[PDB]
Amino acid sequence: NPNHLSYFKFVGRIVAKAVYDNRLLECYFTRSFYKHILGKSVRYTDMESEDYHFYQGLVYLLENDVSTLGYDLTFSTEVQEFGVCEVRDLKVTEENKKEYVHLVCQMRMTGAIRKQLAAFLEGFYEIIPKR
């Protein structure tokens, strides 16, 4: 849909109207999307629901030495958004991997939905103040 951001802002308006009216909707959003609507970071365990084989890659990253990978990595990942695939920087090391897994999970979760999400939040905060 070429207008999709506007429709996400509309549905965000309808969600904030239901909340303002104190009326229950049959919405069942992910914990990720509620975190996005609260401005909270996601956690790597969220990838388990969104992309199991990437969570599994991170679990091979947790509790294992980088030497198990057999090739080097850096802070960059391929993301499909709107059907375009692009390699995006996240800013690897034993200190950074704590950050690599966080930012790569951000990139993989938001990259493909970052603009839909920002439109929804624009629809939401119009009616219900963020604070």
From Swiss-Prot:
Q: Could you say which protein family the record assigns here?
A: Belongs to the UPL family. TOM1/PTR1 subfamily.
| Identification of the protein by name | E3 ubiquitin-protein ligase HUWE1
Tell me the tissue specificity.
Weakly expressed in heart, brain and placenta but not in other tissues. Expressed in a number of cell lines, predominantly in those from colorectal carcinomas.
Name the disease: Intellectual developmental disorder, X-linked, syndromic, Turner type: An X-linked neurodevelopmental disorder with highly variable clinical manifestations. Common features consist of moderate to profound intellectual disability, delayed or absent speech, short stature with small hands and feet, and non-specific but recurrent dysmorphic facial features such as macrocephaly, microcephaly, a broad nasal tip, deep set eyes, epicanthic folds, short palpebral fissures and a short philtrum. Patients may manifest other features, such as hypotonia, seizures and delayed bone age.
What is said about the domains? The HECT domain mediates inhibition of the transcriptional activity of p53.
Q: Which residues of the full protein are shown?
A: 4100 to 4237 of 4374
Quaternary structure, from the entry: Interacts with isoform p14ARF of CDKN2A which strongly inhibits HUWE1 ubiquitin ligase activity. Interacts with MYCN, POLB and CDC6. Interacts with isoform 2 of PA2G4. Interacts with NR1D1. Interacts with AMBRA1. Interacts with HAPSTR1. Interacts with HAPSTR2. In hepatocytes, interacts with PAQR3; the interaction promotes PPARA poylubiquitination and STUB1-mediated degradation.
Query: What is known about what this protein does?
Result: E3 ubiquitin-protein ligase which mediates ubiquitination and subsequent proteasomal degradation of target proteins. Regulates apoptosis by catalyzing the polyubiquitination and degradation of MCL1. Mediates monoubiquitination of DNA polymerase beta (POLB) at 'Lys-41', 'Lys-61' and 'Lys-81', thereby playing a role in base-excision repair. Also ubiquitinates the p53/TP53 tumor suppressor and core histones including H1, H2A, H2B, H3 and H4. Ubiquitinates MFN2 to negatively regulate mitochondrial fusion in response to decreased stearoylation of TFRC.
Q: Supply the gene name.
A: HUWE1
